[PDB]
């Protein structure tokens, strides 16, 4: 149900895929599962991803459910693969059939490196999928599950700084699973109640205006003090 390129990426051997594409293999040919060799490369190895992209592969190749390779790279937490894809011209706001942008998946799993790399390229934290789970909502659910370590806490900090302001309450009530963790419920209530500092709002507006660019390079062109540049890049 899969062509040799698919198996070569499964074994995650960059050399084999390179020598196979050197003779003119159809890189973008789809297999039985509606996957592309880029999808397999973007789940295992960055070197294979680069080799595959070297031959005009579609970094937006849609799978059976329109899960672009970036989605799988983010979900698997392959930070290097995600960077290689995005730098190569991937759609950092690509939506699958459930409107799950790659940032939504990364936050859902809670990993941090991929979330940071995405936000560096201008991922929109305010994205809402069809069901209605923002990246922050999924990360907060994960934290409530008790699996959240300091890594997940830092990822939540990054998301909260980037989003500018987030309100998890349903009308006047927090989600049930949150309500059963009194200290975390208190923290979320205090975070949500505050309107938010003017500086964070301005930073979010500037980021949105700069969106869809390698933000550090873009902000380097701005005339602000380096402190405010670091602030814009979510270093404070």
């Amino acid at each position: 149900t899969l062509k040799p390129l698919h198996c070569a990426c499964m074994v995650s051997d960059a050399d084999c895929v390179e020598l196979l594409l050197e003779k003119g293999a159809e890189v973008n040919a789809l297999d039985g599962y509606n996957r592309t060799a880029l999808h397999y490369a973007a789940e295992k190895d960055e070197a294979c991803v680069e080799v595959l992209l070297e031959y005009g592969a579609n970094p937006n190749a849609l799978d059976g459910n329109r899960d672009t390779p970036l989605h799988w790279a983010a979900f698997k937490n392959n930070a290097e693969c995600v960077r290689a894809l995005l730098e190569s011209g991937a759609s950092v706001n690509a939506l699958d059939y459930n409107n799950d942008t790659p940032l939504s998946w990364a936050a859902m799993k809670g990993n941090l490196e991929s979330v940071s790399i995405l936000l560096d390229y201008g991922a929109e934290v305010r994205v809402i999928n069809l069901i209605g789970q923002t990246p922050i909502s999924r990360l907060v659910a994960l934290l409530v599950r008790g699996l959240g370590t300091e890594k997940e806490d830092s990822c939540f900090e990054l998301l909260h700084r980037a989003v500018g302001h987030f309100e998890l309450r349903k009308n006047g009530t927090m989600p049930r699973e949150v309500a059963r963790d009194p200290q975390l419920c208190e923290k979320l209530t205090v975070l949500c109640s505050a309107p938010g500092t003017l500086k964070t709002l301005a930073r979010y507006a500037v980021r949105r205006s700069l969106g869809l660019q390698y933000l550090p390079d873009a902000v380097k062109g701005l005339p602000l003090p380096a402190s405010l540049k670091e602030y814009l890049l979510l270093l404070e």
Binding site: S209, L210, Q213, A218, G221, L222
Partner: protein
């Protein structure tokens, strides 16, 4: 319920609050409190339209939705001098600088 305004004249601006049921007279009295110029010497202008003191603010072109704090409804103010009302001289704020190229929409 709550209405957030912005009284302006020349280069002077005032931020305040009021209620829809409130009449123009109390807004004039606040103008007094900040500026100390008798009410009979003060006339309020909305977008180049005269306002009556007895007329309620609510029935005027102001509503809670229309006058949210993040976007208050500007109100013109003029000082009566030497037994006559001055022209509605409102000084617009300085124009923002040109948008930098990197931030320009694509």
């Amino acid at each position: 319920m709550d209405v957030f305004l912005m009284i302006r004249r020349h280069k002077t601006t005032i931020f305040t609050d009021a209620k829809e049921s409130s009449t123009v007279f109390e807004l004039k009295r606040i103008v007094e409190g900040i500026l100390k110029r008798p009410p009979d010497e003060q006339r309020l202008y909305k977008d180049d339209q005269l306002l009556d003191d007895g007329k309620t603010l609510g029935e005027c072109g102001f509503t809670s939705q229309t006058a949210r704090p993040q976007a208050p409804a500007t109100v013109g103010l003029a000082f009566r001098a030497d037994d006559t009302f001055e022209a509605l001289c409102i000084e617009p704020f300085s124009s923002p600088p040109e948008l930098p190229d990197v931030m320009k929409p694509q």
